């Protein structure tokens, strides 16, 4: 019942619907409410809502935002989530001066990988990992949020929706129009986010699909049949692509040390088959001294 919730303030807008911070008047719990209007919907309940709800009810993990309840009032659908204090994007902006302490970056990446590994182990692709969809609390946790673009996949995969992942974090195999994409696309996104936590600027801020590709090519080198077998046969590959040399990773993210650069390069492998899985990444030497410190800033 909505009667037990007192609204506090509007937070923003999700991939679909509007989000409010609210307070359970009886338990005191602070929640986030996602309102989906069913009136104005001549198509019934939106597929994005149907997927987000069904998939999220299955995904109970400390690094995945918890769906607490689903409330059907008159012509409205309310999703009740646990409340988190901030998203990663705004936290990185707030850290413009001091930068983000390595232990926190390490901890955040480790947690994101755990959360993602759980998703993939439960046949769910997120398909929209970006700082704005990663939420942090005051105790040092970070969690995957907004499963509006997610979907349950099969083994092996089928062709799914092509228009997925926010451009900046979109994997090359999607950009090149591969008939099949899988768990690797989410890993690519996390790699981009890893680099962004270190520099506090986006790794590949493209303005279009071709700009996005070329930005990727100029950093990691233009892929050939050796580094990525089958690449020249991909639907949107063109022989006219400029052929850029691959540059040292020490230059892609200069502050990163040996271990970090190692992990990043495996997360950004061109060949989705060679790209590291979230599960395998958990055991990378980069995390040997990982802890879970609180954010160095007041949220």
């Amino acid at each position: 019942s909505m009667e037990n919730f007192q609204k506090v303030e509007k937070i923003g807008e999700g991939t679909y619907g509007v989000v409010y911070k609210a307070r359970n008047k009886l338990t005191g719990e602070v929640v986030a409410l996602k309102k989906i209007r069913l009136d104005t919907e001549t198509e019934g309940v939106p597929s994005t809502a149907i997927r987000e709800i069904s998939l999220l009810k299955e995904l109970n993990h400390p690094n995945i935002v918890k769906l607490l309840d689903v409330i059907h009032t008159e012509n409205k659908l309310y999703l009740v989530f646990e409340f988190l204090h901030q998203d990663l994007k705004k936290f990185m902006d707030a850290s413009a001066l001091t930068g983000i302490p390595l232990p926190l970056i390490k901890s955040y990446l480790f947690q994101l990988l755990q959360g993602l590994a759980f998703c993939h182990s439960h046949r769910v692709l997120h398909r929209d990992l970006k700082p704005q969809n990663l939420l942090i609390n005051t105790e040092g946790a970070i969690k995957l949020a907004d499963f509006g673009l997610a979907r349950a996949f099969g083994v092996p995969v089928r062709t799914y929706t092509h228009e997925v992942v926010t451009l900046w974090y979109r994997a090359p195999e999607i950009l090149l129009g591969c008939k099949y994409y899988s768990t690797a696309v989410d890993i690519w996104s996390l790699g981009c986010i890893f680099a962004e936590m270190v520099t506090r600027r986006a790794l590949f801020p493209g303005d279009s699909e071709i700009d996005q590709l070329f930005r990727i090519f100029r950093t990691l080198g233009t892929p050939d049949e050796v580094v990525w077998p089958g690449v020249t046969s991909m639907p949107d590959y063109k022989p006219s692509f400029p052929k850029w040399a691959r540059q040292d990773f020490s230059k892609v993210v200069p502050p990163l040390d040996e271990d970090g650069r190692s992990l990043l390069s495996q997360m950004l492998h061109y060949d989705p088959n060679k790209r590291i899985s979230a599960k395998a990444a958990l055991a990378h030497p980069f995390f040997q001294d990982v802890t879970k410190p609180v954010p160095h800033l007041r949220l």
């Binding site: 309940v45 597929s47 149907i50 709800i53 069904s54 062709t159 799914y160």
Partner: protein, 257 residues
């Protein structure tokens, strides 16, 4: 590849939590196995007409049986349940789900758009929004990876057989999706190549030929009688070159089990 084992294990767990009640049809006062068989056969047609995934068909049927497992329905409302289920399945599984108006259209104007949307909400409430159910199809595609080498006729024939099981609540409500997929894969493999349930699937699934035998015995009979079954939409569908015309193959007279 890295999560194939994790995922199989998870589906094995979920398929149990998502099983309809095996004996629900007896408790439905005004509907029968036959009426259900007519409904599913029609959904097969809807699937073909709109070029929907087989997964979508399998999901819709799971939604229907779960719905009927806890809700009494008069015969005149059965198709409405089926229509809403197919709409939900489409939304969940399809890249381009047909629009509501098209689902209203295929019911030959038996129901209104308002009825279809209200039922969709009721189905969601009854299933408590738990739509990500394991299907015979999902297990089949996993099993297909154990071919040496891969054979299209085997794969298409397995899907054909798995789909046949959707039509007849008796006896197929009593078997799990992973088990029906097992029988289907073996029966198709044996029919086309003479090979059997490979040892690598025994390791993966824990099922042996003996374990699969009861379901296999049933499926084999359904296969032999398919040309005489009252519902034919599936055979017609699998006449198509898209599925390598596998429904034109002769079932084996014996299985030697």
């Amino acid at each position: 590849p890295d999560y194939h084992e994790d995922i199989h294990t998870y589906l094995r767990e979920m398929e149990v939590k998502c099983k309809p009640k095996v004996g629900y049809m007896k408790k439905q006062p005004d509907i029968t196995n036959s009426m259900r068989a007519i409904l599913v056969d029609w959904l097969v047609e809807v699937g073909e007409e709109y070029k929907l995934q087989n997964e979508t068909l399998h999901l819709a049927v799971n939604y229907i049986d779960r719905f009927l497992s806890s809700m009494s329905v008069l015969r005149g409302k059965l198709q409405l349940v089926g229509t809403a289920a197919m709409l939900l399945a489409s939304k969940f599984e399809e890249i381009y789900p047909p629009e509501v108006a098209e689902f209203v259209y295929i019911t030959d104007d038996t129901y209104t758009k308002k009825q279809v949307l209200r039922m969709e909400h009721l189905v969601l409430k009854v299933l408590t929004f738990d739509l990500a159910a394991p299907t015979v199809n999902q297990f089949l595609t996993q099993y297909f990876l154990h071919q040496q080498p891969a054979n299209c006729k085997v794969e298409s024939l397995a899907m054909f057989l798995g789909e046949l099981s959707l039509i007849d609540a008796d006896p197929y409500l009593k078997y799990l999706p992973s088990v029906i997929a097992g029988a289907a894969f073996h029966l198709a493999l044996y029919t086309v190549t003479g090979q059997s349930w490979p040892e690598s699937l025994i390791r993966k699934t824990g099922y042996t030929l003996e374990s699969l035998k009861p379901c296999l015995m049933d499926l084999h009979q359904t296969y032999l009688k398919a040309p005489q079954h009252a519902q034919q939409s599936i055979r017609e569908k699998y006449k198509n070159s898209k599925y390598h015309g596998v429904s034109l193959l002769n079932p084996p007279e014996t299985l030697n089990l």
